[PDB]
Write a protein that binds this ligand. Sequence first.
Ligand SMILES: [Cu+2]
Ligand SMILES: [Cu+2]
Ligand SMILES: [Cu+2]
Length: 102
Amino acid sequence: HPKLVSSTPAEGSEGAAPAKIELHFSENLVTQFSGAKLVMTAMPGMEHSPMAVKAAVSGGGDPKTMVITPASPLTAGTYKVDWRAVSSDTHPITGSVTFKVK
Ligand SMILES: [Cu+2]
Ligand SMILES: [Cu+2]
Ligand SMILES: [Cu+2]
Protein backbone atom coordinates (compact mmCIF):
# COMPACT_ATOMS: atom_id res chain seq x y z
CA HIS A 1 0.00 0.00 0.00
CA PRO A 2 1.19 3.55 -0.75
CA LYS A 3 2.02 5.76 2.23
CA LEU A 4 3.12 9.40 2.36
CA VAL A 5 6.93 9.50 2.27
CA SER A 6 7.31 13.29 2.26
CA SER A 7 5.63 16.55 1.27
CA THR A 8 6.25 20.24 0.63
CA PRO A 9 5.23 21.91 2.87
CA ALA A 10 5.96 19.23 5.48
CA GLU A 11 3.55 18.12 8.20
CA GLY A 12 3.42 20.70 11.01
CA SER A 13 5.59 23.19 9.09
CA GLU A 14 5.13 26.95 9.38
CA GLY A 15 6.38 29.33 6.70
CA ALA A 16 5.67 31.27 3.52
CA ALA A 17 2.79 30.50 1.17
CA PRO A 18 3.73 27.64 -1.18
CA ALA A 19 3.06 28.18 -4.90
CA LYS A 20 2.09 24.51 -5.03
CA ILE A 21 1.84 21.55 -2.67
CA GLU A 22 3.71 18.34 -3.51
CA LEU A 23 3.00 14.95 -1.96
CA HIS A 24 5.48 12.11 -2.50
CA PHE A 25 4.31 8.51 -2.02
CA SER A 26 6.09 5.15 -1.70
CA GLU A 27 4.15 3.63 -4.62
CA ASN A 28 3.10 4.71 -8.12
CA LEU A 29 -0.46 6.09 -8.17
CA VAL A 30 -3.31 5.49 -10.59
CA THR A 31 -4.08 9.08 -11.61
CA GLN A 32 -7.79 8.55 -12.28
CA PHE A 33 -8.47 7.03 -8.82
CA SER A 34 -6.08 9.22 -6.82
CA GLY A 35 -6.70 12.83 -5.74
CA ALA A 36 -6.89 15.39 -2.94
CA LYS A 37 -8.70 18.38 -1.43
CA LEU A 38 -7.21 21.49 0.19
CA VAL A 39 -8.99 23.02 3.19
CA MET A 40 -8.38 26.14 5.26
CA THR A 41 -9.22 25.19 8.85
CA ALA A 42 -8.33 28.58 10.37
CA MET A 43 -7.07 32.12 9.67
CA PRO A 44 -5.79 34.91 11.96
CA GLY A 45 -8.37 36.56 14.24
CA MET A 46 -11.28 34.25 13.38
CA GLU A 47 -12.78 31.05 14.78
CA HIS A 48 -11.89 27.66 13.29
CA SER A 49 -14.10 26.92 10.28
CA PRO A 50 -13.30 24.32 7.58
CA MET A 51 -13.58 25.62 4.02
CA ALA A 52 -12.58 24.08 0.69
CA VAL A 53 -9.83 26.01 -1.13
CA LYS A 54 -10.19 26.45 -4.89
CA ALA A 55 -7.32 24.36 -6.23
CA ALA A 56 -6.29 21.98 -9.02
CA VAL A 57 -4.77 18.53 -8.46
CA SER A 58 -2.54 16.61 -10.88
CA GLY A 59 0.22 14.03 -10.89
CA GLY A 60 3.73 15.40 -11.42
CA GLY A 61 6.23 13.89 -13.85
CA ASP A 62 6.83 11.26 -11.18
CA PRO A 63 3.90 8.79 -10.86
CA LYS A 64 4.65 8.78 -7.09
CA THR A 65 4.08 12.54 -6.77
CA MET A 66 0.77 14.39 -6.35
CA VAL A 67 0.68 18.14 -7.01
CA ILE A 68 -1.98 20.48 -5.60
CA THR A 69 -1.98 24.02 -7.00
CA PRO A 70 -4.14 26.81 -5.46
CA ALA A 71 -6.17 28.96 -7.90
CA SER A 72 -4.71 31.99 -6.13
CA PRO A 73 -1.89 32.40 -3.57
CA LEU A 74 -2.74 31.11 -0.09
CA THR A 75 -3.22 33.77 2.58
CA ALA A 76 -2.27 33.39 6.25
CA GLY A 77 -3.88 30.50 8.11
CA THR A 78 -3.80 26.80 8.92
CA TYR A 79 -4.43 24.40 6.04
CA LYS A 80 -4.95 20.66 5.58
CA VAL A 81 -4.52 18.52 2.47
CA ASP A 82 -6.82 15.48 2.51
CA TRP A 83 -5.29 13.06 -0.02
CA ARG A 84 -6.44 9.79 -1.59
CA ALA A 85 -3.70 7.44 -2.87
CA VAL A 86 -4.65 4.44 -5.04
CA SER A 87 -2.00 2.14 -6.55
CA SER A 88 -2.85 -0.73 -8.96
CA ASP A 89 -4.94 -3.58 -7.49
CA THR A 90 -4.67 -1.95 -4.05
CA HIS A 91 -7.23 -0.60 -1.56
CA PRO A 92 -7.45 3.22 -1.47
CA ILE A 93 -5.32 4.83 1.25
CA THR A 94 -6.24 8.20 2.78
CA GLY A 95 -4.46 10.68 5.02
CA SER A 96 -4.20 14.33 5.96
CA VAL A 97 -1.28 16.79 5.88
CA THR A 98 -1.58 20.01 7.92
CA PHE A 99 0.58 23.16 7.73
CA LYS A 100 0.46 26.88 8.58
CA VAL A 101 0.92 29.88 6.29
CA LYS A 102 2.17 33.20 7.68
CU1 LIG B 1 -10.39 30.65 3.95
CU1 LIG C 1 -12.28 34.38 8.10
CU1 LIG D 1 -5.31 -3.19 1.20
